[PDB]
């Protein structure tokens, strides 16, 4: 439960259960890496864990988002996966804020903007 991989982290966030997220901070402070690294994001497009987390919601609730964002800001590159955007020509610049706004929800927008972001970021 210390060494984390993209696939298992994506499965963890997908279920919306935040109990097994104990270990992200320990790994990030042990291997000296952030959560915005290529090791956790898609290598073809640039999709990150926040993206998969917000693409799946249980009737509009995903409790893992709060622990994920707080741990991200607790340790991360000056962009806490809120300005890190896709790179594929199909979806260049596509960030988490647009994806959150897509599903026709508002709370996710509240949290994403509150923790800080670049609302002017464009795709």
Resolution (angstroms) equals 3.3
SS3 assignment, position 1: coil
Spatial distance between the Cα atoms of 49 and 24, rounded to a whole number of angstroms: 12
Spatial distance between the Cα atoms of 92 and 46, rounded to a whole number of angstroms: 9
* Residues in the chain, total: 123
List of long-range contacts for 18-25, beta carbons under 8 Å, 24+ apart: 18/63, 18/64, 18/66, 18/67, 18/68, 21/64, 21/67, 21/68, 21/71, 24/71, 25/71, 25/74, 25/75
Spatial distance between the Cα atoms of 51 and 44, rounded to a whole number of angstroms: 14
């Amino acid at each position: 439960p210390n060494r984390f991989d993209r696939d298992r982290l994506f499965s963890v966030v997908s279920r919306g259960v935040p109990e097994e997220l104990t270990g992200l901070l320990e790994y990030l402070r042990r291997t000296s890496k952030y959560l915005t690294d290529s090791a956790y994001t898609e290598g073809s497009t640039g999709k990150t864990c926040l993206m998969k987390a917000v693409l799946n919601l249980q009737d509009g609730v995903n409790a893992c988002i709060l622990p994920l964002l707080q741990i991200d800001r607790d340790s991360g590159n000056p962009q806490p996966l809120v300005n890190a955007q896709c790179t594929d020509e199909f979806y260049r610049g596509h960030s988490a804020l647009h994806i959150a706004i897509e599903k026709r929800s508002l709370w996710c927008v509240k949290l994403l903007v509150e923790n800080g972001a670049n609302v002017h970021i464009r795709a």
